Amino acid sequence: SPSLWGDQFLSFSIDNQVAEKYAKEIEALKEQTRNMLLATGMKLADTLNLIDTIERLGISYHFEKEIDDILDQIYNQNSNCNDLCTSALQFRLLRQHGFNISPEIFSKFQDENGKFKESLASDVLGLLNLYEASHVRTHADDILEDALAFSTIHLESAAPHLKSPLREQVTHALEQCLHKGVPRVETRFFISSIYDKEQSKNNVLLRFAKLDFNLLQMLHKQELAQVSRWWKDLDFVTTLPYARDRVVECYFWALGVYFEPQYSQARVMLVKTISMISIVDDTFDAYGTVKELEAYTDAIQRWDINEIDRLPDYMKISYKAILDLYKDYEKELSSAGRSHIVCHAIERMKEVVRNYNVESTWFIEGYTPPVSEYLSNALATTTYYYLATTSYLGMKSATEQDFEWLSKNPKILEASVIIWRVIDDTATYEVEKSRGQIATGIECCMRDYGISTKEAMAKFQNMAETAWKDINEGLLRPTPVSTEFLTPILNLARIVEVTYVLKPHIINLLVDSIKI
Ligand SMILES: CC(C)=CCC/C(C)=C/CC/C(C)=C/[C@H](O)P(=O)(O)O
Known about the structure:
Blueprint: H1 16-37, H2 44-56, H3 64-77, H4 84-96, H5 124-134, H6 147-158, H7 166-175, H8 183-194, H9 203-232, H10 247-257, H11 264-286, H12 290-302, H13 313-333, H14 342-365, H15 371-378, H16 384-393, H17 400-407, H18 411-427, H19 431-434, H20 441-449, H21 453-475, H22 487-499, H23 503-511
Ligand FHP binds at residues 246, 249-250, 253, 274, 278, 281, 284-285, 356, 359, 381-383.
GO molecular function, one term: 5-epi-aristolochene synthase activity
Subcellular location: Cytoplasm
GO cellular component, one term: cytoplasm
C-alpha cells in the first residue's frame, strides 16, 4: 500500500526569522529554568516534581549536569519523604538515571506479606507514580511484583471521576507508561494534552517547552526533507517497484532513537540505513528466487562492486546503492577521522543478510526448527544489532571501544533485540501463517514445547518482560559504556511499543506544531 504522504515533505525552508526569534527567547527561558533547578531550600517532593516535569516537557536535555547533581545528592542522602507518591517518583527518577536505589523504600507501604496496603487505593497521585515506577523494575525488585496489577485496577476504578487533565493523564498512562514510551511522543502528549491544561502549570516551563519542541521540529523537518530528496534521487519507487516506500516512517524510527539537535548527522545516516535495509528485506520476502537470493547473500559477503554482474539487473541497483551509501558514510566521517568505524555497521549488515537467506531456506524446505535454533538466527533478522550499531555512526563521541563493547552482544542490546523479535512474532502469528511461512516464531514455540498458540504467545510475553528487566539493569551504574550509548538501545525497544499505526505520531511530531 503506497504513501499516504507523497511529496508533502520534499519542500521545507526554515523561516530563519521565526527560528532566531524562538532561539533568543529560549536561551532566556533556559537560564530561568536552570536557576529554578539550582534553587536552595526546596522540599524533596518539590524538587522531584520539578525534575519530573522538566523531563516530561522534553527539555531536560538542556540540564543533564544539573539534574544529575541533584539526583546524585538525593541518592546519597537517602531522606525519607514518607508518602507513596514521592517515594515511587523518587525511585523511578533515580533508577532511570542509573542510581541503584534499594526497592525496600516500598516496604512501609506493604503489609506482612509483601503486598500493598489496600488502604492506599484512594490515593490517586500515589497510585499513578507507583504505576509508572512499576515499569522500571529489575529482577532484584520482587518487592514490586504486584505493584503494577495493584495500581492498575485501582487507577481504572478511579479514573472516570477524576478532574481534567489528571483524568487524561491517568487514562493515557494505563495505555502507555512513561518509561517504555517514545520520548518525543510522550513529550508531545504531555505538553499539549496535559500541562497546557494544568491549572497549576508553571507558565515559564510551558512556554519553554512549546518553543523548544517547535524549534527542534523545524530541524526534524529539514532533515526529513533532505532525506526525502535523497530517497527520490534513487528512484526506487521507479527503478525497483517491489519494496515498501516508508522513508517517512523510517525517519520516525530514527527520530525515536534520538531527537536532540546534536544527533542531527546521526539521525540522517540512520534513516538511510533503515530505508535501505527495508528494501533488502522486501527482496528476500516478496520477490527474489532461491537462486537469486543465494547470489545476493554471497555478493553482500564479498562486498565488492565487481560481484554486481552475478546479480540480475534489479538486484544490481540495490547492491550499488548500498555500497555507495557506505561510501558516503566514510566520506561524511572523513572529516573527524571516524570514517573507519563504518566497517562495524557493514559487518552487522552482512550478518543480517546471512540470516535472511537462512530464513528463506527454512521456508522453502518447510523447516520448523526448535526455539533454540530459531532464535540463534531470528534475532539478527530483527535488524536491531544492525540499527544499534548504525546509530553510533553519527555520534561524534563514539569511540572504537564503544563499538567493541557492542560487537560482543551486550545483555542490554540482546534484551532490546528479543523484545522486537518476540513482539513482532506475536503480532505476526496468524497472517504469516497463511502465507505458509512454516518457521514462524510461535509455531516453533508450539511444536517445541507442546503448548498451544495461547500458551506460546504467553511465554513470549514473559520473554519480553524479562528483557525489559534486563534493559533496566543495563542502565544501572557503573555502566559498561557512557549512558549516551545505552539510550539508543533503550529507545529502540521503546519504538517497539509504540509501533506494535504511525500516522498520528508522524502528524503530531512532523506535521503539526504545538500551538502556543
Ligand atoms: C519501514 C520500517 C518499518 C523500518 C523499520 C522496521 C524494521 C526494523 C523491520 C525489520 C524487517 C525484517 C526483520 C526483515 C527480515 O528480512 P525477516 O523477514 O527475515 O525478519
